[PDB]
Every structure is written in structure tokens, then in C-alpha cells.
Amino acid sequence: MRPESKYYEKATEEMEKAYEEFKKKGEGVEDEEAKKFYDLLTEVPRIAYEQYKKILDGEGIEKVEVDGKEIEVPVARYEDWEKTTPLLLEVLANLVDASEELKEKLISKAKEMITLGKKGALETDPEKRFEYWKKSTEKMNEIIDLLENGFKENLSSLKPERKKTYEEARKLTIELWSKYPEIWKKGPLGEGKVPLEETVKQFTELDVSAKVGFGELVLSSEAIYSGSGH
Ligand SMILES: *C/C=C(C)/C=C/C=C(C)/C=C/C1=C(C)CCCC1(C)C
Numbered sequence: 001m002r003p004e005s006k007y008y009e010k011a012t013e014e015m016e017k018a019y020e021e022f023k024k025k026g027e028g029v030e031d032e033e034a035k036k037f038y039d040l041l042t043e044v045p046r047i048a049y050e051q052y053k054k055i056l057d058g059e060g061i062e063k064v065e066v067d068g069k070e071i072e073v074p075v076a077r078y079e080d081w082e083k084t085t086p087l088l089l090e091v092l093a094n095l096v097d098a099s100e101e102l103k104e105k106l107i108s109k110a111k112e113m114i115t116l117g118k119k120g121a122l123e124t125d126p127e128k129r130f131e132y133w134k135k136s137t138e139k140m141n142e143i144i145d146l147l148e149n150g151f152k153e154n155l156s157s158l159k160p161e162r163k164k165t166y167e168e169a170r171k172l173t174i175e176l177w178s179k180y181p182e183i184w185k186k187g188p189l190g191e192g193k194v195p196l197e198e199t200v201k202q203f204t205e206l207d208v209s210a211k212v213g214f215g216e217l218v219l220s221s222e223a224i225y226s227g228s229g230h
Contacts, residue, residue: 003197011204015049051080078118085110113139162223
């Protein structure tokens, strides 16, 4: 087994348990609004499970030549992110009843953020690799700027419980997402300070926090039910 195989195994298992758990809890939820939250936050770990499973199953990796060495890049994980980051932002958008314009902008930027990062990951030219990372971080910064701007995220309209859940969920999102570029930077595709193994491990831990942790936080909320948010 390759050093990083165990963290791909861990992620697969962890996501599968989360998917099954959320799905089970949601099966008894008949509220129209809450069912939507269960739907999105069940789908997110399901996708992660499927994509990590592909890696585990010997698909979803591409080799990229870096500094004379071949790096096994998990392209399947980028395809996961490309799908789940917009869904997670859709959850935040729904919590604060954001406009269509704002929701679509967030979703767009998330997709672009991951597309750029994946382009970076597959670049053999170090200068182009950095550039793609930089452009991706700019999309991430734009997302965070939108989330943080209190004029754009009108909260005055929310019930206390709902506002609190939003604040917690937004804080978690910003804390976690901000860490992804730093792991990338320190890993084999960036500075090469941290081995691939450690990099994979740290990403799996973020992913679990970002999907399972975030899912548990929102789904355990009293504020996702009809007439409970506004
Ligand atoms: C469920 C998975 C989640 C929430 C993944 C989030 C991933 C990111 C925020 C990734 C960001 C990146 C950059 C801003 C720089 C380029 C490399 C990326 C794609 C790791």
C-alpha cells in the first residue's frame, strides 16, 4: 500500500458513514424546508464517498511530473470539490435567504475556484502552477468577501435561532476553506515542504470537517424548519 492509501481509505469510510447517517435521519423528516437541507447535505457526502471510492479503486489519479518526480494527483477529488463546494454555498445561501443573483454568483465562483486549482495541479510548469493557485485563491477570497459583507448578507430579517446557525455555519466555512490553499502551497505541488502523504491526510480532515462537521451543525439546527427562519 502507498503511504497515502490509508487516508483515502479513511475518507471513503468517513464520508460513507456520514451519507448513511444523514440519509437515515432525513427519512423521518417531513417538513418541506428541512427536507431540502437534508437533501443537499446528504448529497454532499455521497459525492465525496463516491469520488474517494474511485481513488481507492485505482481510478481518479493522474501522474504529474514535478521537479523530476511523478506526483499522483487525485483528479477525482477535484471533481468532488467541483460538485460539492457549490452545494455547500447553496446551503449558506438558503440559510440567509440570499437573492438568486448572490446565490448564482457564489456557485459560479466556487466552480471556477476548483477548476483553476485542478488546472494548477496538472501543470508541470512551476510558474503556471503558481499562477493557477493564485487565481484560484482570488476566487476564494471573493467568496469569503461576499460571505462576510453584512450589507450583502441581510440578517436583520432572520429569527434569532436561524441567524445563529447561519453565523456558526459561515464561520466554519471560512475557517476551513481558508486552509485549503495553505495545504496546497506547502505540499508537493507548491513549496514541497510537506510530503504527498501528509497533504492527502490534511485534505481528508478538512473535507470531513467541511461536509460531515458542517452537515451535523446545520442538520441539528432548530432553524431549518418551515416558519422557523423568518
Ligand atoms: C467538500 C470539499 C470542500 C469544501 C473543498 C474546498 C476546497 C477549496 C476551498 C480549495 C481551494 C483551493 C484554492 C483556493 C487554491 C488552489 C487549490 C485549491 C483548489 C485547494
